[PDB]
C-alpha cells in the first residue's frame, strides 16, 4: 500500500456486525425515547412498560427503595415511580359517569335539563348536587311535594316557564 | 446434623407495594418448621450439594470465613460453569467454564483451568450478625435475596429483600461453597487435614412450591406469614 | 351480633362487586387478558377470534 | 331521548340516555435513559486494524 496506487488498491477498512438471537435474555438495547411528564390532566402513560390512563397527582405513600409499583385491592395500579427521576406519582382515573335527561313532557314544553350523575361541574344555569351536576334548572329555596326525583333529596318540576330544582 | 427451621426464609416476591392488606401467593418458599442440614466451618474439601429448586443459605460467623459460592452442572470446563466470589472490596460474578480441581481453592486467589467467559459483573460487596441468603434460578434469571440481622436460628420474623436479579441463563444443576483462611496454602488436591479457621457454621435448606398468606403493614413491609398447608388451623 | 342481618346485606353486595371486578383478570382461554397485548402481538384476522 | 325510547312523544320523567367520558388530553411514554453504552465508537475509531 502506497499512495500512487489507484482506487481499486486503496486499503478499505471494513467492519461486520453479526447479531445472534438464539435463547436471548437480551442484554443490549439502547433506544432513548423519553418525553417530559405531564400532571393533573387525563394522559396516556407508559412507565417502563406499564401502560394505562388516568390523572397524575403528587404521591403521599412511602415506597420502599426496591419497589417500583403500587396496587390496591383487585390489582388496580394506584401509583408508579418514574424511571428517570424516581419520584412517586398517584394514578386516579379521571371522572366519568352516566347522563340523564330531565323532561317535563313533550306535550307541556320542549325545554329540557340534563343531569350528569358522577361528576363535579368543574370538569363537565349550572348547579351542584350530591347526585351530580345539574344543568338547565334553577335552584329555588321553596320546598314542594316533588314529582321528578333526581336524587339525594332533590327533585325538579315545571315552574309555570322554567324547570326548578 | 438437623434442626427445625422456624418462621424464616420469607421474602418479598414481587417488589410491588401493598398497604394494610393480606395477600396469598403461590411460589417456591421454605416450609415452616422444616428441618435443615447443619454444618461446621472448621475443616473439610467441601462435599457437593444439589441445586434442586432453590437453596436457603444462612450463616452465623464473625471472621469472614465464608467468601463465595460456585454453581453449575459440572466442575469441568466442558460447560460454561458459574462463579460467584465476594470480597472486602467488591463482588466478582463470572460465567466462564473454568475447569476446577477436586476441591474449591481456599483463598492463592484462584485455582481453575482456562476460561471462555461470556458474562462478568462487579459491584459493592454483599456485606453475632445472622446473614441470610436465598438463591433462585427459574425463569432464565438467577436471583439473590438477602438480609443481615442482629441476634441457633432466632424465633423472630423477618423477610428477605431482593438484592440482585441477574440475566445469565446458565443451566445450573449442582452447587458448592467457597471457604477462606488467612495465610493458608492452596493446592489442587488436599487431604482431610485442612487448615485452622474461626468457629463458624452454615445452614442449608431446600425451597418447595407452597402457598403463603403474607401480611403487609401500613408501610409495605411483611410482618407475618401463614403456611397454607402446615396444619388444619393454618389451612 | 345484634345487627347481623344489615351487615350481611352490606357484605353480600360488597363481595358481589368485588368478585365481579376480580373476574376481569381471568383469561377465559385467551392467550392474554389485557386487550393491548392481544391487539399488539397478533394480526387482525386471528386477533378477532 | 325520543330516539332511545323509540317514540316521538316522551312523557314526563327522568331518562338515562347515554354516557359521557372525557378523553385523554395528552400521551406520554417513559422509556430507558441509556447509561453505559457500547464501544462501537472505539471499535471503528481505534485505528489499529
Ligand atoms: C299540544 C298538545 O300536545 N296538546 C295536548 C293534546 O294533544 C291532547 O289531546 C290533550 C289531551 O287532553 O292534552 C294536550
Ligand atoms: C363538590 C365540589 O366541587 N367539591 C370540591 C370543591 O369544594 C373544591 O373547591 C374543589 C377544589 O379543591 O374540589 C372539589
Ligand atoms: C335566588 C335565591 O333565592 N338564592 C338563594 C339565597 O337567597 C339563599 O340565601 C341561599 C341559601 O339557601 O340559597 C340560594
Ligand atoms: C464453549 C466453547 O465455545 N468452547 C470452545 C472449544 O470447544 C474450542 O475448542 C475452543 C477453541 O478456540 O473455543 C471454545
Ligand atoms: C431446556 C434444557 O436446558 N434442558 C436440559 C436437558 O436437555 C438436559 O438433559 C438436562 C440435564 O443437563 O438439563 C436441562
Ligand atoms: C409502623 C410503621 O411503619 N411506622 C413508621 C415509622 O417507623 C417511621 O419512622 C415513620 C416515618 O417514616 O412512618 C411510620
Handedness of CA B32, B33, B39, B40 (dihedral sign): positive
* Secondary structure of residue B234 in the 3-state scheme: coil
Q: Are A73 and B21 a contacting pair at CB < 8 A?
A: yes
Residues in chain B closer than 8 A to A63 (CB atoms): 17, 220
C-alpha distance from residue A162 to each of A122, A140, A156, A157 (Å): 24, 11, 10, 8
Q: Where are the beta strands (DSSP E) in chain A?
A: 43-47, 50-58, 69-71, 77-81, 88-92, 96-103, 113-116, 126-129, 132-135, 148-151, 154-158, 163-164
Q: Are D14 and A43 a contacting pair at CB < 8 A?
A: no
Atom 2 of ligand 4, residue of closest alpha carbon: B116
Q: How far is it, in rounded angstroms, from Cα B135 to Cα B206?
A: 10
Q: Are A75 and C36 a contacting pair at CB < 8 A?
A: no
Phi then psi for residue A114, to 5 deg, are -115, 135
Q: How far is it, in rounded angstroms, from Cα B54 to Cα B86?
A: 20
* Secondary structure of residue B93 in the 3-state scheme: strand
Residues in chain C closer than 8 A to A51 (CB atoms): 36
* Secondary structure of residue D13 in the 3-state scheme: strand
H-helix segments, chain B: none
Strands laid side by side in the A77-81 sheet: B16-17, A69-71, A77-81, A88-92, A50-58, A43-47, D26-27
B19 lines ligand 6 (CB under 6 A): no
C-alpha distance from residue A75 to each of A27, A31, C16 (Å): 30, 30, 17
Q: How far is it, in rounded angstroms, from Cα B182 to Cα B64?
A: 10
Instruction: Tell which CATH architecture fits domain B2-235.
Output: Sandwich (2.60)
Q: How far is it, in rounded angstroms, from Cα B101 to Cα B118?
A: 21
Residue labelled with grid coordinates 475447569: B99
What resolution in Å is listed for this PDB structure? 3.4
Alpha carbon of B120 to ligand 4 centroid (Å): 18
Phi then psi for residue A123, to 5 deg, are -135, 35
Q: Are the C-beta atoms of residues A46 and A38 closer than 8 Å to each other?
A: no
Q: How far is it, in rounded angstroms, from Cα B81 to Cα B94?
A: 9
Q: Are C21 and A74 a contacting pair at CB < 8 A?
A: yes
Residues in chain D closer than 8 A to A148 (CB atoms): 12-14
How many CB atoms lie under 10 A from the CB of residue B101?
16
Q: Are the C-beta atoms of residues A45 and D24 closer than 8 Å to each other?
A: no
Ligand 2 closest atom vs CA A122: 3
Q: How far is it, in rounded angstroms, from Cα B171 to Cα B123?
A: 23
Alpha carbon of C30 to ligand 5 centroid (Å): 30
How many CB atoms lie under 10 A from the CB of residue B74?
13
A:B CB pairs within 8 Å: 39
How many CB atoms lie under 10 A from the CB of residue D26?
12
Q: How far is it, in rounded angstroms, from Cα A123 to Cα A129?
A: 14
Phi then psi for residue B33, to 5 deg, are 60, 25
Atom 6 of ligand 5, residue of closest alpha carbon: B171
A:D CB pairs within 8 Å: 119
Q: Domains of chain B: which residue ranges?
A: 2-235
Q: Are the C-beta atoms of residues B22 and B214 closer than 8 Å to each other?
A: yes
Amino acid at each position: 500500500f502506497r499512495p500512487t496506487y489507484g482506487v481499486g488498491h486503496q486499503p478499505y477498512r471494513v467492519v461486520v456486525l453479526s447479531f445472534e438471537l438464539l435463547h436471548a435474555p437480551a442484554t443490549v438495547c439502547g433506544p432513548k425515547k423519553s418525553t417530559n411528564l405531564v400532571k393533573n390532566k387525563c394522559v396516556n402513560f407508559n412507565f417502563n412498560g406499564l401502560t394505562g390512563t388516568g390523572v397524575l397527582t403528587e404521591s403521599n405513600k412511602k415506597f420502599l427503595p426496591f419497589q417500583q409499583f403500587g396496587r390496591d385491592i383487585a390489582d388496580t395500579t394506584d401509583a408508579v415511580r418514574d424511571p428517570q427521576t424516581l419520584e412517586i406519582l398517584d394514578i386516579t382515573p379521571c371522572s366519568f359517569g352516566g347522563v340523564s335527561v330531565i323532561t317535563p313532557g313533550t306535550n307541556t314544553s320542549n325545554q329540557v335539563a340534563v343531569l350528569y350523575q358522577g361528576v363535579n361541574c368543574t370538569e363537565v344555569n349550572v348547579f351542584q348536587t350530591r347526585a351530580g351536576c345539574l344543568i338547565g334548572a334553577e335552584y329555588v329555596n321553596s320546598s314542594y311535594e316533588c314529582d321528578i326525583p333526581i336524587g339525594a333529596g332533590i327533585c325538579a318540576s315545571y315552574q309555570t316557564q322554567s324547570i326548578i330544582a | 446434623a438437623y434442626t427445625n427451621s422456624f418462621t424464616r426464609g420469607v421474602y418479598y416476591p414481587d417488589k410491588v407495594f401493598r398497604s394494610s392488606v393480606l395477600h396469598s401467593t403461590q411460589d417456591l418458599f421454605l416450609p415452616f418448621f422444616s428441618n435443615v442440614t447443619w454444618f461446621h466451618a472448621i475443616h473439610v474439601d467441601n462435599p457437593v450439594l444439589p441445586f434442586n429448586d432453590g437453596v436457603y443459605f444462612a450463616s452465623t460467623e464473625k471472621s469472614n470465613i465464608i467468601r463465595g459460592w460456585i454453581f453449575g452442572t459440572t466442575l469441568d470446563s466442558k460447560t460454561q460453569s458459574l462463579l460467584i466470589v465476594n470480597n472486602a472490596t467488591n463482588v466478582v460474578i463470572k460465567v466462564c467454564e473454568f475447569q476446577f480441581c477436586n476441591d474449591p481453592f481456599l483463598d492463592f486467589r484462584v485455582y481453575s483451568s482456562a476460561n471462555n467467559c461470556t458474562f462478568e459483573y462487579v459491584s459493592q460487596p454483599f456485606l453475632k450478625n445472622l446473614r441470610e441468603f436465598v438463591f433462585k434460578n427459574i425463569d432464565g434469571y438467577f436471583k439473590i435475596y438477602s438480609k443481615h440481622t442482629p441476634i441457633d436460628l432466632p424465633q423472630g420474623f423477618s423477610a428477605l429483600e431482593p438484592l440482585v436479579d441477574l440475566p445469565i441463563g446458565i443451566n445450573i444443576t449442582r452447587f458448592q461453597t467457597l471457604l477462606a483462611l488467612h495465610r493458608s496454602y492452596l493446592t489442587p488436591g488436599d487431604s482431610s487435614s485442612g487448615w485452622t479457621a474461626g468457629a463458624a457454621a452454615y445452614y442449608v435448606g431446600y425451597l418447595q412450591p407452597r402457598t403463603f398468606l403474607l401480611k403487609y403493614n401500613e408501610n409495605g413491609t411483611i410482618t407475618d406469614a401463614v403456611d397454607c398447608a402446615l396444619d388444619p388451623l393454618s389451612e | 351480633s345484634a345487627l347481623g342481618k344489615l351487615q350481611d346485606v352490606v357484605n353480600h353486595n360488597a363481595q358481589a362487586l368485588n368478585t365481579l371486578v376480580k373476574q376481569l383478570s381471568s383469561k377465559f382461554g385467551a392467550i392474554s387478558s389485557v386487550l393491548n397485548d392481544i391487539l399488539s402481538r397478533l394480526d387482525p384476522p386471528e386477533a378477532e377470534v | 331521548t325520543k330516539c332511545t325510547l323509540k317514540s316521538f312523544t316522551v312523557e314526563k320523567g327522568i331518562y338515562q340516555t347515554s354516557n359521557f367520558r372525557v378523553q385523554p388530553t395528552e400521551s406520554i411514554v417513559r422509556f430507558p435513559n441509556i447509561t453505559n453504552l457500547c464501544p462501537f465508537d472505539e471499535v471503528f475509531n481505534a485505528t489499529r486494524f
